[PDB]
Motif scaffolding. Structure first.
Motif, mmCIF file in Angstrom:
data_model
loop_
_atom_site.group_PDB
_atom_site.id
_atom_site.type_symbol
_atom_site.label_atom_id
_atom_site.label_comp_id
_atom_site.label_asym_id
_atom_site.label_seq_id
_atom_site.Cartn_x
_atom_site.Cartn_y
_atom_site.Cartn_z
ATOM 1 N N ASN A 264 42.635 38.960 27.233
ATOM 2 C CA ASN A 264 43.817 38.690 26.421
ATOM 3 C C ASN A 264 44.680 37.637 27.117
ATOM 4 O OD1 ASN A 264 43.093 40.724 24.418
ATOM 5 N ND2 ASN A 264 44.552 42.189 25.259
ATOM 6 N N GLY B 281 43.601 35.750 30.009
ATOM 7 C CA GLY B 281 42.839 34.765 30.737
ATOM 8 C C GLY B 281 42.385 35.040 32.146
ATOM 9 N N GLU C 85 38.835 35.861 31.629
ATOM 10 C CA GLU C 85 38.177 34.651 31.141
ATOM 11 C C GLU C 85 38.030 33.605 32.244
ATOM 12 O OE1 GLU C 85 39.771 32.407 27.757
ATOM 13 O OE2 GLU C 85 38.264 30.871 28.059
ATOM 14 N N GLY C 86 39.003 33.426 33.137
ATOM 15 C CA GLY C 86 38.818 32.430 34.190
ATOM 16 C C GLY C 86 37.794 32.865 35.227
ATOM 17 N N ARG D 156 34.382 32.141 33.807
ATOM 18 C CA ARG D 156 34.067 30.713 33.851
ATOM 19 C C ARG D 156 33.855 30.252 35.286
ATOM 20 N NH1 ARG D 156 33.997 28.880 28.987
ATOM 21 N NH2 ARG D 156 35.352 29.751 27.376
ATOM 22 N N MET E 122 25.803 27.530 38.090
ATOM 23 C CA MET E 122 25.347 26.159 37.916
ATOM 24 C C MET E 122 24.969 25.530 39.255
ATOM 25 S SD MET E 122 28.301 24.875 35.236
ATOM 26 C CE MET E 122 27.769 24.204 33.646
ATOM 27 N N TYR F 14 43.297 47.186 28.261
ATOM 28 C CA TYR F 14 44.702 47.214 27.837
ATOM 29 C C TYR F 14 45.067 48.619 27.381
ATOM 30 C CZ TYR F 14 45.552 42.414 28.838
ATOM 31 O OH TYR F 14 45.710 41.223 29.505
ATOM 32 N N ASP G 20 41.460 41.937 22.784
ATOM 33 C CA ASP G 20 41.248 41.526 21.400
ATOM 34 C C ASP G 20 39.906 40.865 21.173
ATOM 35 O OD1 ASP G 20 43.631 42.611 21.380
ATOM 36 O OD2 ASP G 20 44.824 40.767 21.187
ATOM 37 N N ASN H 220 48.598 49.808 38.446
ATOM 38 C CA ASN H 220 49.844 50.140 37.779
ATOM 39 C C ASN H 220 49.631 50.877 36.457
ATOM 40 O OD1 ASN H 220 52.520 49.474 38.881
ATOM 41 N ND2 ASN H 220 51.610 47.445 39.252
ATOM 42 N N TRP H 221 48.405 50.939 35.980
ATOM 43 C CA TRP H 221 47.943 51.647 34.802
ATOM 44 C C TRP H 221 47.052 52.844 35.158
ATOM 45 C CZ3 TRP H 221 49.516 46.738 34.242
ATOM 46 C CH2 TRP H 221 50.404 46.514 33.186
ATOM 47 N N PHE I 128 42.851 41.389 44.601
ATOM 48 C CA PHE I 128 41.863 41.079 43.579
ATOM 49 C C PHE I 128 40.836 40.068 44.057
ATOM 50 C CE2 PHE I 128 44.404 37.330 43.087
ATOM 51 C CZ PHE I 128 45.679 37.789 43.362
ATOM 52 N N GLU I 129 41.162 39.146 44.965
ATOM 53 C CA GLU I 129 40.154 38.154 45.352
ATOM 54 C C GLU I 129 39.209 38.687 46.421
ATOM 55 O OE1 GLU I 129 40.493 34.408 47.800
ATOM 56 O OE2 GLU I 129 40.063 33.397 45.898
ATOM 57 N N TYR J 63 36.833 40.735 44.342
ATOM 58 C CA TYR J 63 36.049 39.825 43.496
ATOM 59 C C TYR J 63 35.027 39.121 44.377
ATOM 60 C CZ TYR J 63 34.972 35.627 40.817
ATOM 61 O OH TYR J 63 34.331 34.584 40.200
#
Ligand code: HEM
Ligand code: HEM
Ligand SMILES: Cc1cc2nc3c(=O)[nH]c(=O)nc-3n(C[C@H](O)[C@H](O)[C@H](O)COP(=O)(O)O)c2cc1C
Lengths: 152, 439, 438
Positions: free
Chosen positions: A11, A13, A16-17, A20, A27, A58, A64, A95-96, A131-132, A135
């Motif tokens: 929702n 990005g 999404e980032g 990508r 690649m 969410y 979405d 936090n959730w 998070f990194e 990840y």
């Protein structure tokens, strides 16, 4: 040049980032990566190569652009997910409380109670901490899991 | 329907007519949304998409098909979005960090070097800060704005072409001969912008870009979908776009933030206490900026009250119904009034007009689509992490190094262009005499 | 005649020798260039400072500050004894920190240039020396490195001095073309006085004063009278320090960098000393004192092109010079410092060579052989200040950057009240060493 499809549920990005970014390092590792939302390959999981699934949650629900996928995944199970060798990366926030990483978890384990080729154990990112780090951990471990699995 | 402060005029109207109202021109129908529930519905991407307002179309004359002034279906929006998104992540901010501190240090040092009887022009200094910051982090180029009265020739031309584009919107008679010098000046500014940025791109391709900045990523990036990278021209339009999308939005945030702090001294004191506890080295590290939690809350609460890109436009992709009550035809325009959304009492409580950073102490407490200072969906602001990283860092350093004075008892005056700014906001800084890097 | 009079008088010295005379109706001037005669002209019981026409024209805005006063004037000796302690080597310790403050701004400007750009040397050095005197002098920040257009004070000061110098070459001073010059001239004086007069009063009312030249002046007393300088003279002295040190010092720095890039093995040797000695992010006072070869580099630039190239004297009585040139009371002597500095029976046969080694053993040098700061009680009161500034700045320059003479600059020496290497430019290449104030 093996087929690496990366799907996201996002929702805002972050997922999404990350997706990508993965397709960008693929690649560099000779794959033939493809990036798309989750609920756009709803039913069209790749029966060859592997599919990285990067998604947020969410309030316990799919983003979405991922709702059609999960619903398809939840009820629909008939069109089994056999052949599909995947892996899941989770974008969440501590936090959730009670909903932490519920969607990635759902997808991961549901995909497996339908015939999984889980080549690499799920990975989690806590936006509220490191998070990194996570990840990064999941990624390095990930490339190798799929490495050894197929080609090198 | 004339006034130089339309968004503010439209919030007033929203307070009278509610969550939706419509203006009509000969061939145009515009509906303005103010409630979280309708805006929530309008941010359904399968139903609504980004619309280019007239303003955006005017800026397109120099920003071209960069991300900000592009239609979603354009080839180069898709490509550029797919290629740049990872370069704008929170993690990516770790390598931009050092150059952000570089320009932040220059801002602090300028204020330290002021004589006692002078004062600070806040939105003016925040803009110098943000323009140089975007240039250095983005394409290793120093405009050195703090070493001049007159800005770098690029900046002068960019600011002038954007002011020209905004002005066109209120020109009763564009073809009047008085607008002739404007028209040729406009072409000249475009040529200075294009020429400098093109040259920088060409020098870097030649240089082999031994850097790791946005320009590096754009020259080396490959769109998976098409397999092709961005061409030199679009790359230049993306660089022009980062400066214009990002200089007065971020500028204004830091300025409104300082405004509310000096208007709310106990809040100031609390942010200053956190900046003093957390920033323990001569210059902030990336990890320390991420620990500036209250500073962060201050920034979100200033973006709640006066989000500096206060409106965005949408169009119905197909005929549809809104709120189960309001018929729309394909192509009808919806304008989201973000400062109104941010005042929805059914979401925020009754105290919406109060500066209270503590609202954001609990992120899970804020529902989706209640807070959208950075727009929506795939068309949301790609620069969001860059801007918040810069502002938290800079505001933290400001509060660590100085006490501030509202020496004129400034009366808030919000100038509207593409963005919002506290026009004429001035303060006096009193140094706490803490060196930034050593004595 | 010429725009370069001192260089022209040097050529004539080359041909006529240690003394020659020019005569106008009323005015006779003799030009001295040997250590042998200048040594006599430096006997203050026989010769005193003369105010040339230039200084008379500068006096219109510098008034009776130290530089443009007669020795006999009341305000000269009084100011001289009051301000002398403020300029000693000892006092340099107390200016060092603010000196470093502006020197850091210089180095950070150059650090922050894009690779395609270049440095305007005398331009930047004048920015630095002006802001240094302002801050060290009366705690005021011109912030020259934050501007395209200098601070209004500086614009006016520079313009008034230019007009003073231009007035010298004016054949028809009252031509109507000069009417605006005259008005602008009065406008500039008001600017200068109004700013300085205000800074003084503010400090007088200040109840937490400092220890700079302004406070030393506000508290200094005339032994006899038991009183200090009045606020107008203090204002004149402030204007005087900016005037007398801004281009003299910047010229020194400029010529010194000139001679270093033209003499790359001397640059290296100077740079090797800055690296060894400047081992802290910000220079300390002791460390500046340890820069001996950088100190010699500067002395050699002063020897070849002393940036206040001449000083004027008058015979206080009838007397004979060198036992063979009779002088009448009031006859002006002009000391050509660059010629003196090339006196072959003193410096040897390589006088156009840039050899800092000459200053290896200062005790070697005979009295009145090296005089870039003038003579006796009328010598430059700001010599220590100037040399401390230049040593500190050149040292930091040589520490933080490599220099390239990218244009292969041809020396072109502009003459005003001072000397400068007109249009000297370079390129700096960072050694990427951080400092204080970053
Ligand atoms: C606090 C400051 C900022 C705010 C409040 C802000 C707000 C926004 C908003 C509301 C949008 C959507 C506009 C629309 O829907 O028509 C947007 C788009 C954009 N922002 Fe920002 N922005 C900020 C800072 C930045 C910065 C620093 C950059 C650049 C590094 C940036 C780059 C852009 C770009 C390129 C887009 C277009 C993205 C796309 O549609 O693909 N903005 N911004
Ligand atoms: C490398 C730099 C400098 C050089 C070569 C230099 C040289 C001179 C010379 C040759 C004199 C004698 C003038 C005459 O006989 O007519 C002198 C006097 C003077 N200089 Fe400097 N100067 C330098 C910089 C400074 C600075 C930095 C200051 C001020 C802060 C300063 C303040 C003065 C003053 C006040 C006088 C007059 C002293 C008196 O007669 O009592 N000078 N200077
Ligand atoms: C309204 C809201 C609800 C969220 N709910 C959860 C949740 O249930 N579980 C979780 O792990 N994280 C939750 N998060 C944290 C987000 O998943 C985290 O920000 C994610 O990184 C956002 O990814 P995205 O930008 O791709 O959409 C929530 C965030 C928001 C704003």
């Amino acid at each position: 040049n093996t087929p690496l499809l990366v799907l996201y549920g996002s929702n805002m990005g972050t997922a999404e980032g990350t997706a990508r970014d993965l397709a960008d390092i693929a690649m560099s590792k000779g794959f033939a990566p493809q990036v798309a939302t989750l609920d756009s390959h709803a039913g069209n999981l790749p029966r060859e190569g592997a599919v990285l699934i990067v998604t947020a949650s969410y309030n316990g629900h799919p983003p979405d652009n991922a709702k059609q996928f999960v619903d398809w995944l939840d009820q629909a199970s008939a069109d089994e997910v056999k052949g599909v060798r995947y892996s899941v990366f989770g974008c969440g926030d501590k936090n959730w409380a009670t909903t932490y990483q519920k969607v990635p978890a759902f997808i991961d384990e549901t995909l497996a109670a339908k015939g999984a080729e889980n080549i690499a154990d799920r990975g989690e990112a806590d936006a509220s901490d490191d998070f990194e780090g996570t990840y990064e951990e999941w990624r390095e471990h990930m490339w190798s899991d799929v490495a050894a699995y197929f080609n090198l | 329907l004339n006034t130089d402060k339309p968004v503010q005029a439209l919030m007033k109207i929203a307070d009278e007519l509610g969550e939706i109202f419509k203006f009509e021109a000969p061939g145009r129908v515009t509906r303005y949304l103010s409630s979280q529930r309708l805006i929530k519905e309008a941010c359904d991407e399968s139903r609504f998409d980004k619309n280019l307002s007239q303003a955006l179309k005017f800026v397109r004359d120099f920003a071209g098909d960069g991300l900000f002034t592009s239609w979603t279906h354009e080839k180069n929006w898709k490509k550029a979005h797919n290629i740049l998104l990872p370069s704008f992540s929170q993690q990516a901010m770790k390598g931009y960090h050092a150059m952000m501190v570089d320009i932040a240090v220059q801002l602090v040092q300028k204020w330290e070097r002021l004589n006692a009887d002078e004062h600070i022009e806040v939105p003016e200094d925040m803009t110098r800060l943000t323009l140089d910051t975007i240039g250095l982090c983005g394409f290793n180029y120093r405009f050195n704005s703090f070493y001049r009265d007159q800005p770098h020739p690029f900046i002068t031309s960019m600011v002038r072409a954007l002011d020209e584009a905004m002005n066109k919107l209120q020109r009763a008679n564009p073809d009047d001969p008085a607008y002739d010098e404007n028209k040729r000046q406009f072409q000249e500014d475009i040529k200075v912008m294009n020429d400098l940025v093109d040259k920088i791109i060409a020098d870097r391709k030649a240089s082999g870009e031994q850097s790791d900045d946005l320009l590096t990523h754009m020259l080396n990036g490959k769109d998976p979908e098409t397999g092709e990278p961005l061409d030199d021209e679009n790359i230049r339009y993306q660089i022009i776009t980062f400066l214009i999308a990002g200089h007065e939005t971020t500028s204004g945030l830091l300025s409104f933030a300082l405004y509310f702090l000096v208007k709310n001294p106990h809040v100031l004191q609390k942010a200053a206490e956190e900046a003093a506890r957390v920033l323990v080295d001569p210059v902030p590290s990336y990890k320390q900026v991420k620990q500036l939690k209250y500073v962060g809350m201050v920034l979100n609460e200033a973006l709640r009250l006066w989000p500096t890109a206060p409106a965005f436009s949408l169009y119905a992709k197909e005929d549809t119904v809104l709120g189960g009550e309001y018929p729309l035809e394909k192509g009808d325009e919806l304008m989201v009034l973000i400062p109104q959304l941010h005042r929805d009492k059914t979401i925020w409580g009754d105290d919406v007009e109060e500066f209270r950073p503590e609202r954001f102490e609990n992120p899970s407490a804020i529902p989706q689509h209640a807070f959208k200072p950075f727009g929506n969906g795939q068309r949301a602001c790609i620069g969001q992490q860059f801007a918040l990283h810069e502002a938290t860092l800079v505001l933290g350093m400001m509060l660590k190094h100085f006490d501030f004075e509202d020496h004129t008892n400034y009366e808030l005056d919000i100038k509207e262009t593409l963005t919002l700014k506290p026009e004429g906001f001035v303060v006096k800084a009193k140094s706490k005499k803490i060196p930034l890097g050593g004595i």
